[PDB]
Design a protein around this ligand. Structure first.
Ligand code: GIY
Ligand code: NA
Ligand code: ZN
Length: 896
């Protein structure tokens, strides 16, 4: 309605008009890494579908100087063309190009624009990044990051994922720099002044948010896949030795993704570059995937086995995105899960297929449990929810769109079989190649999948209808269902419910939270007598089944492959617990993990008492399966840290004693080395970290001895990676070791070692030392600002830093909003990581007042409600179960 120069804007909708459709961008960028600014020009080929007097596109923080319109099909706009009037509307981040004469439909025009801006200083758009060399030199590079709505900060464009087009990129650079982009380099021309100009191959049809171009001086290692794709791993020169595994894994993973999807990677080259200053974990720019140094680089001397697993995960995630994201892109950000959820799920398939030795199949259950934590609350959301403003679009990248989408995909695969599910995937990818799809399109392609007139045809059409109907309820409804199972000789009564955390069965608002929710749950169950898996689809609120066997216990949801919680009435829980204590080996390992998880969730839900869960944790002395052991230990360790965060010293000390005593044999048999399998090493790390956290004398002595030897040798003696973080943390307890660790941090060349050292420094007791770490992170010179969100979290969870971090966030909010966006993942993680652990009425009131203060200033986020409800959850869990824990621990002291 208005503009910066007055006058009216010929558009209101924050969505661009569908009239002018782009076809081809000609993008020339001239960045100057000395003045830290860039000048650029573009020529967009547009197709006019309806007669209009104006074109609307996106532009943000770009000074536009020249704007012309040419046409080869409309003679009125012949060469050299006419000038266009530019109107700016920053409220919607749009600009309007006013044309002198109405354009003709079904024709093609060319929009040329010259613009310029400074290199950004944050994490978005075309921004500047620095790295440190081995000798101490500091170098500068320029990198792009556009997802979701930041491509408009680099060049004016139709910045929506539906407006796919081709891209011809040209970059002007000095001789000391190289230029990378999406496509390979076709030609380099030498300029008069001595500069160089790189011309890149034209890109295929793709959305704007995947455009990338980098000017740097990195070194790379190259390799070729089976299908001839040139994979190159780029990184800072002094770090080239850290890229070997990243190349090996990318090659293998790319070959698998081609074989599995039956579609070749279409570009001739694929580049993986490790950016020093990078906010997200990685970004899937087509042919130029940018990574954090901790997500791509692997150094055997300082990287643990878990680091190897994370690097493999992120490479598999980003490579899978090349199909689920670049090849087939969503229609709009409301269905963001169509990209992210699939990629998260494809991690499991790809890693487990290519690196089964990493045993990521056992770890996948955590992905679902993390969302169950947030889905059992009223403040959750459906996987497909509309979004409009850029902040809302950024908020769509949450655990819902990622993990929940991945988990229901795994549930649907278990229901349909791997062959049928794979065929549906291949049909979906081949059908929507180089275009966009939506939620309904995916479910149609997945249900109407052909493995490898008749009654088989009628059952095939009925079952495809069934599948589509089933998944529609899983994507359009929030929450997670709870299955109540009641046994009766041969009868089995099944009830479905909306599982709620911290809202019991009789609470006055529990019936107002059971409104219209109903799920088509594909139940699977096995019995104590027959190992045969039984399948049944629950389509109503209540149902009954019959199994002629009359057995002891019935275990529903085999391997927890279904997105639901099971509850057993009567003697069901007692039968299962007795089964575990006698011979846990009769139940499947994933069944044990699901049982432990579900038991503790129901204890919070009010369907079970805490002593029941604590009595189940008795069999953990007989457990050998690492996942189940680590699950129970994590619950007990969470209980200890929940007590220690408060001043409850008696319960905390009793929990420490029980953990050190009941789990002494497993702790003592652990070595201080990097030997064994992946889960063997991860079990060692977790157990030794737990023991050293509880001030166990042998752990502390061994860690102090290792740290003393390492410091006296000055890096010459080697600490095992699996124990590296533990040793450094213990060493940081002394001012001498603390300062030495900070100095080694500044001088280190391994990002993994730096991450371990930073954690170690955060485990200090002195208030001034933690505050200095926070201030260093804010400054961004020694400790990079990209680590701030993580650092604050590590400090706030500990008792000494809880109030310090909370005070810092409340006081320096305005300074934080200058470094990150409101909807950015960093701000969301800062708020949650400093507030969600609170479990008192006073802290809940403080957080409520803080969020209200953030309101009325223009800042609103969904994480506000989620944090509040979680703090409320914690308060209710304490008041309802605190004396029970006390009594159980005291009873254990007397039971011997
Ligand atoms: C497993 O390895 C991973 C996991 C996630 C990612 C994120 C990445 C992506 O997945 N791209 O496809 N991404 C999203 C955006 C834009 N939105 S953002 O608000 O700025 C935001 C940034 C990070 C988020 C996040 C991180 C962890 C969990 C949930 N969310 S959310 N840019 N890059 C990369 C690799
Ligand atoms: Na994506
Ligand atoms: Zn992703």
């Amino acid at each position: 309605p208005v503009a910066t120069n007055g006058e009216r804007f010929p558009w209101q909708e924050l969505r661009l008009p569908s009239v002018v459709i782009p076809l081809h961008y000609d993008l020339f960028v001239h960045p100057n890494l000395t003045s830290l600014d860039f000048v650029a020009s573009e020529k967009i080929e547009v197709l006019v579908s309806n007669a209009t007097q104006f074109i609307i596109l996106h532009s943000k923080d770009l000074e536009i100087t020249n704007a012309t319109l040419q046409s080869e099909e409309d003679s009125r706009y012949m060469k050299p063309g006419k000038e266009l009037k530019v109107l700016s509307y920053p409220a919607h981040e749009q600009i309007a190009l006013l044309v002198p004469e109405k354009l003709t439909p079904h024709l093609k025009y060319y929009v040329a624009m010259d613009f310029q801006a400074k290199l950004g200083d944050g994490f978005e758009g075309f921004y500047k990044s620095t790295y440190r060399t081995l000798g101490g030199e500091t170098r500068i590079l320029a990198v792009t990051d556009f997802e979701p709505t930041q491509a408009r900060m680099a060049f004016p464009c139709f910045d929506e994922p539906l407006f796919k087009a081709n891209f011809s990129i040209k970059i002007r650079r000095e001789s000391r720099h190289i230029a990378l982009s999406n496509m390979p380099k076709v030609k380099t021309i030498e300029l008069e002044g001595g500069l160089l100009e790189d011309h890149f191959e034209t890109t295929v049809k793709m959305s704007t948010y995947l455009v990338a171009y980098i000017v740097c001086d990195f070194h790379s290692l190259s390799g070729f896949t089976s299908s001839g794709v040139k994979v190159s791993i780029y990184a800072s020169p002094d770090k080239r030795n850290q890229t070997h595994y990243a190349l090996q894994a990318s090659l293998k993973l790319l070959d698998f993704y081609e074989k599995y999807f039956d579609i070749y990677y279409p570009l001739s080259k694929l580049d993986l570059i490790a950016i020093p200053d990078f906010a997200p974990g990685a970004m899937e720019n087509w042919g130029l995937i940018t990574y954090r140094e901790t997500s791509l680089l692997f150094d055997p001397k300082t990287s643990s086995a878990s680091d190897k697993l994370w690097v493999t995960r992120v490479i598999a995630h980003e490579l899978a995105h090349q199909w689920f994201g670049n090849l087939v892109t969503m229609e709009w950000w409301n269905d963001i899960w169509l990209n992210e959820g699939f990629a998260k799920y494809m991690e499991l398939i790809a890693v487990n297929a290519t690196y089964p030795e990493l045993q990521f199949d056992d770890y996948f259950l955590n992905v679902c449990f993390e969302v169950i934590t947030k889905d059992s609350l009223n403040s959750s959301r459906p996987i497909s929810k509309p979004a409009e403003t850029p902040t809302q679009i950024q908020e769509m990248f949450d655990e819902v769109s990622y993990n929940k989408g991945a988990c229901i995909l795994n549930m649907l695969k278990d229901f349909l079989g791997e062959e049928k599910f794979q065929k549906g995937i291949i049909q979906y990818l081949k059908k929507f190649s180089y275009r966009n799809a939506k939620n309904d399109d995916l479910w149609s392609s997945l249900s109407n999948s052909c493995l490898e007139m008749t009654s088989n045809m009628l059952a095939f059409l009925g079952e495809n209808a069934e599948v589509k109907e089933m998944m529609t309820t899983w994507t359009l409804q929030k929450g997670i269902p709870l299955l109540v199972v009641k046994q009766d000789g041969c009868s089995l009564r099944l009830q479905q419910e909306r599982f709620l955390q911290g809202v019991f069965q009789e609470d006055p608002e529990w019936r107002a939270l059971q409104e219209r929710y109903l799920w088509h749950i594909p139940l699977t169950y096995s019995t104590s007598s027959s190992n045969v898996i039984h399948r049944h689809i629950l389509k109503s609120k209540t149902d009954t089944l019959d199994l002629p066997e009359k057995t002891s216990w019935v275990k529903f949801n085999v391997d927890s492959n279904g997105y639901y919680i099971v509850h057993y009435e009567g003697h069901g829980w007692d039968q299962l617990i007795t089964q575990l204590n006698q011979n846990h080996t009769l139940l499947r390992p994933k069944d044990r993990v699901g049982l432990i998880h579900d038991v503790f969730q129901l204890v919070g839900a009010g369907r079970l008492t805490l002593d029941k869960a604590l009595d189940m944790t008795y069999y953990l002395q007989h457990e050998t399966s690492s996942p189940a052991l680590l699950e129970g230990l994590s619950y007990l360790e969470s209980f200890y840290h929940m007590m220690d965060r408060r001043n409850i010293s008696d319960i905390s000390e009793n929990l420490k004693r029980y953990l050190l005593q009941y789990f002494k044999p497993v702790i003592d048999r652990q070595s201080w080395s990097d030997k064994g399998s992946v889960w063997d090493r991860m079990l060692r790390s977790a157990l030794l970290k737990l023991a050293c956290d509880l001030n166990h004398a042998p752990c502390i002595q061994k860690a102090a001895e290792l740290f003393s030897q390492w410091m006296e040798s000055s890096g010459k003696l080697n600490i095992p990676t699996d124990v590296l973080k533990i040793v450094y943390s213990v060493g940081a307890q002394t001012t001498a070791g603390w300062n030495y660790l900070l100095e080694q941090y500044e001088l280190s060349m391994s990002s993994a070692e730096q991450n371990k050292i930073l954690y170690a420094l955060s485990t200090s007791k002195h208030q001034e030392k933690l505050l200095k770490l926070i201030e260093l992170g804010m400054e961004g010179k020694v400790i990079k600002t990209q680590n701030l969100a993580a650092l604050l979290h590590a400090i706030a969870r500990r008792p000494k830093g809880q109030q310090l971090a909370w005070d810092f966030v409340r006081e320096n909010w305005t300074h934080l909003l200058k470094k990150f966006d409101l909807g950015s993942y960093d701000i969301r993680m800062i708020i949650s990581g400093t507030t969600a652990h609170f479990s008192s009425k006073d802290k809940l009131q403080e957080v409520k007042l803080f969020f209200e203060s953030l309101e009325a200033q223009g800042s609103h986020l969904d994480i506000f409600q989620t944090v509040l409800e979680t703090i409320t959850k914690n308060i209710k869990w304490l008041e309802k179960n605190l004396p029970t824990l006390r009594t159980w621990l005291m009873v254990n002291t007397r039971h011997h």
